[PDB]
């Protein structure tokens, strides 16, 4: 069972995945990253419940047609009969979306534990690429930064977070700290203070 | 089919993977290395397909199942799925490549600026852990909460340990009605639980 390893389409379109079998029937599985494979097609053409009507399958070869392409259809699709390699389906032309930024100062609990951490929460953006710079007062912060790789979430938009570690004495010695998130050549800045 | 989120071992050990639910029906086990299609490694409780090594052995006791992997070898790091009739969530199996490390867990109350916008979000920061797999459970006062919970998938930071964060979206009325909120992180079978209060 060999499959094309990738394919793509734009929302509203119709895409199909191509795929011992001449006698037996073919099943299809949809798998999202970090998730168990989910059956979406039965004895060539019967859908499990919960699978939308947009999905139809047909059958030495077998095919999975996906109608009215949506962002949530982005996935790996495997052929199976009595598994194929896989087909990663990419939904292109999804809308751009600027990020939501929320900056959290160190809590009284942490500062009492003689530590201090700031979190810059970044969510609800697309595409999944950002850059982060920090600022102490108005000056660059060049030490103690980590920014996670953005991962797609339920709402089909990306989320990441950047954190900064300081001593309590630094967080008070300054007047404010700032987190600046650049997404598609447009920047958003948030500031917190003691 | 309940199935533990993650497990781990070092080369040469015997590692087992559990699966529970299935008393009147058999269980299959699937191996999926990164970037590959799921492969059948065990059917009808304990029947090894052709090219599976002897060291894989399936069993089933009561209404629970198990897959044991003897002589753990680096080519076995993968996801393992159990699949019975009337698919488990999976188990991430890691062949330890560095010393295990338990996560730092830091919980934040909502920020001053976002309340003035009718938003109240909690953040549970999770850093410095290996292997890179955790599960997060939020609780309001003493009650489970899943409405509005989003967790980022972990990524390797500069100390070669992993980091992630879970965040809870609430209104300010939810945030002010409860006496406390809790974040619990489970890693390598252990839990840590931090708590906040307005």
Author numbering:
A (entry chain A): 4 to 22, 28 to 67, 70 to 92, 101 to 212
B (entry chain B): 4 to 24, 29 to 93, 101 to 212
What does the paper say about this structure?
LCs were distributed in two groups: a set of eight amyloidogenic LCs responsible for severe cardiac involvement and symptoms in patients (hereafter, H LC), and a set of five non amyloidogenic LCs isolated from patients affected by multiple myeloma for which no amyloid aggregation or proteotoxicity was observed in patients (hereafter, M LC). Five H LCs (H3, H6, H7, H9 and H10) and two M LCs (M7 and M8) were successfully crystallized and their 3D-structures solved. The crystal structures were all refined to satisfactory refinement parameters; in all cases the LCs were dimeric, with an overall quaternary arrangement closely matching that of the previously reported LC dimers. VL and CL domains display very different structural properties in the seven crystal structures. CL domains (res 115–214) are typically characterized by high quality electron density, are all very well superposable, and the dimeric CL–CL arrangement is clearly conserved in all the analysed structures (root mean square deviations -r.m.s.d.- generally fall below 1.0 Å over the entire CL–CL dimer - Table S3A and Fig. 4B-bottom).
Interestingly, most LCs show a one-step unfolding process, but three H LCs (H3, H6, H7) and one M LC (M9) display a two-step process, observed both in Far- and Near-UV temperature ramps. Analysis of the data shows that the kinetics of proteolysis correlate well with amyloid propensity: H3, H6, H7, H9, and H16 are almost or totally proteolysed after 60 minutes, and more than 50% of H10, H15 and H18 LCs is cleaved after three hours. Inspection of the SDS-PAGE gels shows that the proteolysis pattern is different in different H LCs, suggesting that the sequence of proteolytic events, and not only their kinetics, may be characteristic of each H LC. Firstly, and somewhat unexpectedly, the most temperature- and trypsin-sensitive LCs (H3, H6, H7, H9) could be successfully crystallized. Such results indicate that, although characterized by low stability and high dynamics within the group tested, these LCs display a properly folded native structure devoid of large disordered regions that would hamper crystal growth. In H6 and M8 dimers all six CDRs (three for each LC monomer) are traceable in the electron density; in H9 and H10 five out of six are traceable, in H7 three, and in H3 and M7 only two CRDs are traceable. In the structures of all H LCs and in M7, the association interface is roughly symmetric, and is located on the five-stranded beta sheet (strands 1, 3, 4, 7, 8), where the 3, 4, 7, 8 strands establish the intermolecular contacts.
